[PDB]
Symmetry: D2
């Protein structure tokens, strides 16, 4: 909801990827990754409510999507540990970010849709 | 040499082997005329479809028969085939590689155009 | 709306692809492509209302997305004429189909999300 | 031979040339230890990163420095880099090709694992 949303789809089943764990980190002043927010995708493959416009300040963020556990639960041993998405946010003022990922066992893609509010 | 097709399997992390590929050229009456065809190799590649002489400017379609590939693997697919439609242009680079990455409910295709 | 929706995104701009022409065809009994529906994507990159559950019977359908005109209007000469999506629909009863496409000048992807109503 | 990286540019339909690539291996203290690196060739490829001897089972990360690539082209990009994280497994095929297809606001990566 509002400034950061994550959407995950399954390219094998043509479906939302449900119950996928997502961890967001923010680079701290000492160049370490600090925990920022986390959650799981819903029945629609979406994860809303990770942060607020106030909390989501300028910075470098990493969205980890735990794809390996997703595939393993479906009986599949996939190639990747997780899909990582690393980006600078809000450098030119607040924006609305949708981070999308499309998953296959040995491949994925990831796409950002960015809107000006 | 001027046209190659390369196909990968995103589920198995492998070349997509034995996939039928049909190339067509658009005729003056806007129908698709068979132009060349073959099956992908053990490396997922299909070479020797055409020649510099035959591959003149025009509109081409490459059909990759993905449904039969997934059916052989016992995996239910969405698409009948992947279609790639483009105009060949002499002003650009001399070689077209039409690549495709296949999943049961999604495909990605790219053109790598080089000299 | 209801059983067939098309969504188009621009991978260069990280935005919906707006005002993209979309033509849907259905294979007739004489194995020819008959016009079925058409429209343009909205400001959200979506195209709703192409058909109804009544009209969208079993068959083989082709969704043509006119990507070349889209890129040309942005000053770009792209590789493909259009993105084609060809599929059998409703073979096992009515379903809800979202046909998504992600566009770049020399590449695209397309993905179906299929739901049981 | 056991690890290759191949990078393509979806905007220009070309190999992505001169892209920095850094490989890391996960250490016992869960930090990332520099393992190998290089720049993609004129064919968008990076060979000779490691050896059969050195490429033991473990968790590896391949970072592809996409932001600097797009910046050089004058195109505003979204990601800092593309990351690819995986466990090397001796039970599987002997060669890993890590491929990536780049756009300014989207990337796709595949592992092609072969003998
Ligand atoms: C990058 C790629 C996967 C890797 C492919 C590949 C893999 C190994 C290799 O030796 C060559 C290629 C060329 C096509 C490449 C695909 C084009 C696009 Br459709 C796909 O994302
Ligand atoms: C995952 C996706 C980008 C995000 C798209 C998206 C974005 C926002 C949203 O609300 C829905 C979708 C569904 C299609 C999704 C695409 C399908 C495939 Br063609 C592409 O990789």
């Amino acid at each position: 909801k509002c400034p950061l949303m994550v959407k995950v789809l399954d390219a094998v089943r043509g479906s939302p990827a449900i119950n996928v764990a997502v961890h967001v980190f923010r680079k701290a002043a000492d160049d370490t990754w600090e925990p920022f927010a986390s959650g799981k995708t819903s029945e629609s493959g979406e994860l809303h409510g990770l942060t607020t416009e106030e909390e989501f300040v300028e910075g470098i963020y990493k969205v980890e999507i735990d794809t390996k556990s997703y595939w393993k639960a479906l009986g599949i041993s996939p190639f990747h540990e997780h899909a990582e998405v690393v980006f600078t946010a809000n450098d030119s003022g607040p924006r609305r970010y949708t981070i999308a990922a499309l998953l296959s066992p040995y491949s994925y893609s990831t796409t950002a849709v960015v809107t000006n509010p």
